[PDB]
Amino acid sequence: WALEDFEIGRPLGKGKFGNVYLAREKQSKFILALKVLFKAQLEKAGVEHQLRREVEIQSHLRHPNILRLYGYFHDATRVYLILEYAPLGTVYRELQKLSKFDEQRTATYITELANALSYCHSKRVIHRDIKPENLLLGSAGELKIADFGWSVTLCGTLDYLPPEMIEGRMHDEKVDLWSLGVLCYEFLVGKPPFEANTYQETYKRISRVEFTFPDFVTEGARDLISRLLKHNPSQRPMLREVLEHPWITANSS
Amino acid sequence: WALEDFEIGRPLGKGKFGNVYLAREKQSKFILALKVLFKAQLEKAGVEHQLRREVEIQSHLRHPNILRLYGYFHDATRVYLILEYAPLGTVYRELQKLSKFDEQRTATYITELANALSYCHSKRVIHRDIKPENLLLGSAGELKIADFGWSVTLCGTLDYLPPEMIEGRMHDEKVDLWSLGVLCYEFLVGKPPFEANTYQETYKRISRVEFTFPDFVTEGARDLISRLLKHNPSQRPMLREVLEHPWITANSS
Numbered sequence A, B: 001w002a003l004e005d006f007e008i009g010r011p012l013g014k015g016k017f018g019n020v021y022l023a024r025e026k027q028s029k030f031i032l033a034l035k036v037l038f039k040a041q042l043e044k045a046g047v048e049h050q051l052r053r054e055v056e057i058q059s060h061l062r063h064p065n066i067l068r069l070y071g072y073f074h075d076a077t078r079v080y081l082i083l084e085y086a087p088l089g090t091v092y093r094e095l096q097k098l099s100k101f102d103e104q105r106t107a108t109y110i111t112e113l114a115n116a117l118s119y120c121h122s123k124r125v126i127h128r129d130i131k132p133e134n135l136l137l138g139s140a141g142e143l144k145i146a147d148f149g150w151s152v153t154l155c156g157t158l159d160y161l162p163p164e165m166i167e168g169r170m171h172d173e174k175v176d177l178w179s180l181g182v183l184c185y186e187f188l189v190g191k192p193p194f195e196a197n198t199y200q201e202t203y204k205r206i207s208r209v210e211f212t213f214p215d216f217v218t219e220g221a222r223d224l225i226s227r228l229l230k231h232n233p234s235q236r237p238m239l240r241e242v243l244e245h246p247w248i249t250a251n252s253s
């Protein structure tokens, strides 16, 4: 794989880490997206190890609701990621356009997200927080997790370590349950549940789990969102509980 | 401060990070220990930031049961730490020499440790795991914590973070309560409570908190050790509870 194998189109975002472009593989004429990351930028920020781990994880993820990584390559200064192109843009842009989503559209997206996350959980892969600007849309309107936000000793010290230092990240697998609650609310309401005018007030609202619903949010949607937005991570439902929630099964396409 | 200000004596340990030596300040003839760390070694291991934070914390710690950092200095390639010299060596060496400690010696050391840790807790400083080889002894037999094992955002992301990602390290302040339990047991018994022939068996014993006491360990010592060695960090006592435990108040000098 080399840069010359691709015809480049319009930019699809610019950042300090990498630029993304629409591209076409020259031989096949297959449309895709090419992300170019600069090695020195990744090294200077101490994110190069984190990137390699996320790319290795992402290589084995094949799901309709996860943005596909077709392959990758590099040269002396840059790493190139060959990605699926999602033609309908972000869920964030769609929410801006529509103001808020109806219950069918929302339950469908939540199902797609929980399916992707359940598929990853079965491979012992968990995801961190999820933002709607990192959720892309395919030609048939399928949502695509596109952030790559995945995660999978000193001598003579084991004897002295407590269980929490050796058992690993205990309930880090529950961060994405809280993200589904925030997204389900944001999709129905048009804004995230803890949004406030200042950092301190936003922090207070999340830490105390202080949120209310507009009157139009229905009983089923409130029940699901209230179960997802638990302060204690272990009390948040399993993804299989989300997929079988009656508001989800009634409204999801 | 410069190297020429000190007369160097015998080595007090050698490692890939730094060498320690007995030293005497030339003008005052005051005995101390000088630790020399190589900047390139610290940088290559990605421990240089961690070191600066621990040294900054350690600069403000003045307690008879914490090894004193008198000051520090550097040149082009190395960082020098000017430390208190503890003439009676480690608690680890004393335990080897005596086989095990009596209840008075043990309760006294536990008190000294809990006092140091309580003093740090009041300054919002917590400690990680504690090993007896990092516990030194002063001329009057006072134990000295000497490991420096102390500890004190993306745009548009706060709205999407769960409480556990913003509230910080929740109960990391409880690791050192588990260390006091392991040390109290090791001091009375002569070996740590979860010691086993293999890594897998040691891991199993800590994770399941599977330990027993030799018949000679008394009721009071069992009560304290059993309260410290709780799997759930939040259920371990506060340091003030350790200091007021009747086995401690009865046996501590």
Ligand SMILES: C[C@H]1C[C@](Cc2nc(Nc3nccs3)cc3ccccc23)(C(=O)O)CCN1Cc1cccc(Cl)c1F
Binding pocket: A011, A012, A013, A014, A020, A033, A035, A083, A084, A085, A086, A087, A088, A089, A090, A093, A133, A134, A135, A136, A146, A147
């Ligand atoms: C900064 C924005 C630019 C972006 C451009 C854009 N992309 C597509 N489809 C793609 N399929 C693959 C990659 S982009 C379709 C578009 C349709 C109309 C308008 C802009 C479009 C947008 O404005 O929606 C995409 C989202 N982020 C970047 C970004 C964020 C996370 C991950 C990735 Cl990989 C990423 F690129």
Ligand SMILES: C[C@H]1C[C@](Cc2nc(Nc3nccs3)cc3ccccc23)(C(=O)O)CCN1Cc1cccc(Cl)c1F
Binding pocket: B011, B012, B013, B014, B020, B033, B035, B083, B084, B085, B086, B087, B088, B089, B090, B093, B133, B134, B135, B136, B146, B147
């Ligand atoms: C590898 C061993 C070597 C050591 C040497 C030694 N030190 C002292 N007293 C000191 N007061 C200040 C620093 S050393 C007294 C001794 C008495 C007899 C025999 C050896 C002695 C030992 O064998 O006990 C000390 C413990 N660790 C090193 C070590 C570990 C953690 C922190 C530090 Cl700073 C450190 F140096």
